[PDB]
Design a protein around this ligand. Structure first.
Ligand SMILES: Nc1ncnc2c1ncn2[C@@H]1O[C@H](COP(=O)(O)OP(=O)(O)O)[C@@H](O)[C@H]1O
Ligand SMILES: Nc1ncnc2c1ncn2[C@@H]1O[C@H](COP(=O)(O)OP(=O)(O)O)[C@@H](O)[C@H]1O
Ligand SMILES: [Mg+2]
Ligand SMILES: [Mg+2]
Ligand SMILES: [Mg+2]
Ligand SMILES: [Mg+2]
Lengths: 121, 192, 121, 192
C-alpha cells in the first residue's frame, strides 16, 4: 500500500507530507501540488508521474478540489495499479489514512474510517 | 460528416475563437470560479495546434486522440479532463463512424461520466446535450447555442468551483458552457 | 468579517492562502502555520497574532487538528473580536467560506453552508 | 499545603523527572502520536524553570500564572493549552486556597473544559481524576499513580492524535498520562 496526495498547491502538498511524516515515517508517500511552473493548478502529467513514482501497487489517494479528483480518476483508468479515490478532506483524510497505515491497520479498516468522513465535493 | 481536412479546419477555427475570447472566458470564471477558464483553454489549444502541425494523420480518429491527450496534459483545471475525455471517446467513435451526432453523443457521454453532471447543473454538459438534440432534430444553429449560453446564467451550479457559491452562482454565465459554444459554432461553420 | 487559517504547517497555511486568493482577492484574510522555529505545531501567541493582524472584528476561523482548535478557543476567550471556530475541513471549509464571503454571502448563509460539512475533529 | 518555597521545589523536581525521562515520553508518543511529547515538555519545563528564577513571587498564585503562560508559549502541541489551562485555573484558585485537592480540582476542570475529554478516554484527564479521587479518600500514592499509567495502555484512544489510530492505540501507554504521573509523584514528595 501507498498514499498519494494531490493538491492545487505545491506548498499544501509539501506541508501535508511533512505533517504526515511526523506520524508515518515508513509508509510509501507521494505528495504533489501545482503546475510545472509552481503556480496554483493541477497537472495531469504530474499526477500520472506521481502514481508511477510511488513504489506501491495499491494506492490510497487524496485530493483538494474536484478537478484534482478528475486527474486521479483519469490516471486510475490508465494504470494496472489499484487506486482508491477517497472523497474526504485532504488534510484530515490523508492524515488519518497515513497514521492508520503506519500503525499497521488493514486496507478495510482504513476504508471504514474514511467512509465516516465523506464530503460533497 | 467531418473529414481529416475539415477536422483540422474546425480545430484551427476553434483555437482562433479561444485565443480571441480568452479574457472574456476568464472574466466569466471570476464570480463563479478562480478566473482562469480562458487561460486554461488558450494554453490547451495553442499546444494542440502545435501538436497537429508536427503530425501527419491517417484518419480523423487519430486527430481526436492527439487532441484528447494534449488537452488532458495542457488544460490545467476541470476543463482539461472533461474536454480530454470528450475527444478521447470521440476518437474511439471516429473509428466506426464520423456521423456528427454520434461523435457529440460519445463526447457528451464521456463528459457526464468524468464529471458526474446531469443536464441542469450549470456546466458544459448543458450545451453538449442541447447541441446533440439539435443535430438529431436537424435544427442546430449558432442562435440555438447562444440560447443555452445565456440560459446557463439562471441555473444553480451544483458542480465544479461554481457550486461553492450556492445561489450566488445565479446571474452568472457558465464559462465552460461558453467555451463549448465556440467549439460547436466553429464545428457548424466547417461541417455543413 | 474576515477569515483566519490556523495550521500545524507554515507551508499549508501559505499554500491555502494562495489557493483562496484566486477566488477571494478582496476579503480580509490571515493564515498562520507552525511554531516560531519553522517546526510543525501551533501556539497561543501565533494564533493571537493572526487574530489581531486581521483587519476585521468578526472572524470565521479554521484549523487542521484538535490542538490548533484549542489555541483558537483560548484566543476567543481573550479577545474582544468575535470568533467563530468551525469544526470543518481546513482546506475545503476555509475555501467554501472565503469564496462565499468574496461573493457577498451573509454570515448566516456562510454558517448554513459550513453546518453542512461538520466533521469530528 | 504548598508554599512559595515548596511550590518552587515541586516544579523543580517535576522539571527533573521531565528532563530525565524525555526520550521515554516521546517514545510513548510514537505509536499513538507524533513522537514529540517528551521534547515538548522538556522545552516547556526548562523554560518554566528559567522564568521562575528571574521572577520574584509574592504568592503561589503568581507562580502558577507564570507556569501557565510559559507552557502556553513554549509547548507547540496539545499539552501546552492543556497544562497551561490547568495551571491558569490553579493560579486563580490559589488566590483563595492552597488546599491540594481544591487545586487539582481546578486543574482537572480546566483540562476537561479545554480538551473536552471524559474520564476513560485515554488522556491525562484519567490520572488527574484518579489522583483527585485518591486525595479525597486520603489514599494518594506513587503506587496508585503508576497503576493508572499502566492502565492507560488498555484503553481505546478517543481524543487527540492517538484517536486517529483507532483500535491500534490499544496496548500503548498514553504519554500525557505519564507526564502527569511525574507531576503528581513529585507533588506527593514535597506535600505528603
Ligand atoms: N463536474 C463537472 N462536470 C461537467 N463540467 C464541469 C464540471 N466541473 C467543471 N465543469 C466545467 O468546467 C468549467 C471550469 O473550467 P476551468 O475554469 O478551466 O476549471 P477550474 O474550475 O478547475 O478552474 C465550468 O465552467 C464548467 O462548465
Ligand atoms: N483533547 C484532549 N483532552 C485531554 N488531554 C489530551 C487531549 N489531547 C491530547 N491530550 C493529551 O496530550 C498528550 C499528547 O501531548 P503532546 O504530544 O505534547 O501533544 P500533540 O498530541 O499535539 O503532539 C496525550 O498523551 C494526551 O494525554
Ligand atoms: Mg477556473
Ligand atoms: Mg482552475
Ligand atoms: Mg506529540
Ligand atoms: Mg505535536
Amino acid at each position: 500500500y501507498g498514499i498519494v496526495i494531490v493538491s492545487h498547491s505545491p506548498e499544501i502538498a509539501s506541508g501535508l507530507k511533512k505533517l504526515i511524516r511526523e506520524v508515518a515515517k515508513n509508509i510509501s508517500l507521494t505528495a504533489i501540488g501545482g503546475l510545472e511552473n509552481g503556480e496554483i493548478g493541477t497537472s495531469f502529467d504530474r499526477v500520472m508521474n506521481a502514481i508511477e513514482e510511488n513504489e506501491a501497487d495499491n494506492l490510497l489517494t487524496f485530493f483538494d478540489l474536484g478537478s484534482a479528483r478528475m486527474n486521479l480518476d483519469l490516471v486510475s483508468e490508465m494504470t494496472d495499479k489499484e487506486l482508491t479515490i477517497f472523497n474526504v478532506p485532504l488534510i484530515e483524510g490523508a492524515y488519518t489514512a497515513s497514521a492508520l497505515l503506519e500503525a499497521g491497520a488493514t486496507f478495510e479498516a482504513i476504508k471504514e474510517q474514511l467512509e465516516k468522513m465523506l464530503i460533497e465535493k | 460528416l467531418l473529414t481529416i481536412d475539415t477536422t483540422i479546419e474546425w480545430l484551427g477555427k476553434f483555437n482562433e475563437k479561444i485565443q480571441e475570447n480568452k479574457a472574456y472566458l476568464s472574466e466569466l470564471d471570476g464570480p463563479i470560479g478562480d478566473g482562469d477558464h480562458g487561460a486554461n483553454m488558450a494554453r490547451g489549444m495553442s499546444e494542440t495546434m502545435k501538436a497537429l502541425e508536427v503530425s501527419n494523420f491517417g484518419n480523423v480518429s487519430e486527430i481526436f486522440k492527439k487532441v484528447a491527450m494534449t488537452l488532458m496534459s495542457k488544460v490545467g483545471g476541470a476543463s482539461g479532463p472533461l474536454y480530454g475525455s470528450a475527444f478521447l471517446a470521440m476518437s474511439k467513435t471516429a473509428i466506426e463512424t464520423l456521423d456528427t451526432s454520434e461523435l457529440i453523443y460519445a463526447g457528451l457521454e464521456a463528459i457526464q461520466k468524468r464529471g458526474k453532471a446531469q443536464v441542469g447543473e450549470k456546466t458544459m454538459v448543458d450545451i453538449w446535450s442541447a447541441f446533440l438534440n439539435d443535430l438529431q432534430t436537424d435544427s442546430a444553429s449558432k442562435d440555438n447555442l447562444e440560447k443555452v449560453v445565456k440560459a446557463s446564467a439562471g441555473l444553480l451550479a451544483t458542480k465544479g468551483r461554481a457550486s461553492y457559491l450556492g445561489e450566488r452562482s445565479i446571474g452568472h454565465i457558465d464559462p465552460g458552457t461558453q467555451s463549448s459554444a465556440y467549439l460547436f459554432e466553429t464545428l457548424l461553420e466547417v461541417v455543413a
